[PDB]
Amino acid sequence: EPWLKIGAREFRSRILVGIEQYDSVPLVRDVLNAAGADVFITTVDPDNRRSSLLLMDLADELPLDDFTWIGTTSFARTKESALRSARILRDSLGIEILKLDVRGDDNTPDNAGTVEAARELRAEGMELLPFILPDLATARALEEAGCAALRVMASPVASGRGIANPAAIRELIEQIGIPVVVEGGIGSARHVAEAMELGASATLVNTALVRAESPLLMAAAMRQAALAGLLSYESGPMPEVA
């Protein structure tokens, strides 16, 4: 069963791979295959209009119709950067679904700037997946604005620390009706299993896969842990686990 549907596009894979830093077509093919992924992410730097790999750049390598193509605003240090990136993605590439990011000084999401940016892009009809620090009011505001799903920070980007406040994430997931994706600081498979045991619908990983000694093994490990965590969650664990 899909855990998210946007238009005709169905999200099934429980692992999302941040590929926007990749430059190698065969590596992107392999990591996405090993993760069992069904989403392809493309970014754009608004200041020079350089893009990351397009979905079509893997036409020879992947069954493109099995991949939902979405954009991301990963160079945004401000609300204005993000909108500019978002509009380039829509107009030039025809991307309607956006992995929305607005990052503060220390590469942590700016919750206020993200909400503001999200409201402006919703007015234009873009389907959104914003990234936030786990704050209940910020999350409810984004759900009310019509965001398809939220991405909530586990720990800082590239830290591999896993899930810093599981209680806060579980609470948020319990009260928000739309799917939650756990993201940021995921280091290994156990962190993925943990996220699913909190009720997360999926996990997004990036650094874990670039910095593992064997990226494709870690990707396959994470795919498997997501299933394990999901089965664990469905099994109704003994109460003192929660």
- CA distances to 176, 200, 215 from 179, rounded to whole Å, are 8, 7, 27
212 in contact with its own copies (CB under 8 A):
yes
Ligand-binding site membership of 38 (annotated): no
Piece of the chain touching its own copies by CB under 8 A; list 46-54, 87-95, 105-113, 212-220: 212-220
79 belongs to the catalytic site = no
190 in contact with its own copies (CB under 8 A):
yes
What value, to the nearest 5°, has the Cα angle with vertex 11 and ends 33 and 241? 90
Residue 103 forms beta bridges with which residues? Answer: 109
224 in contact with its own copies (CB under 8 A):
yes
- The b/e string for 30-66 (b: 16+ C-beta within 10 A; e otherwise) is ebbebbbbbbbbbbbbbeeeebbbebeebeeebeeee
Ligand-binding site membership of 224 (annotated): no
Q: Which does 137 bind (CB under 5 to 8 A by kind): Ca ion, its own copies, none?
A: none
Chain Cα centroid distance, residue 59: 23
Per CB under 8 A, the list member of 41, 181, 193, 202 interacting with its own copies is 193
Rounded CA-CA distance 19/27 in Å is 10
Per CB under 8 A, the list member of 143, 159, 168, 171 interacting with its own copies is 159
Instruction: State the residues that interact with Ca ion by CB under 5 A.
Output: 21, 23, 45, 47-48, 57, 60-61, 173, 177
DSSP run (H or E) holding 230: helix 215-234
Binding stretches for its own copies (CB under 8 A): 156, 158-162, 187-190, 192-194, 196-197, 207-208, 211-218, 220-222, 224-225, 227-232, 234-241
| Catalytic positions, written as ranges | 99
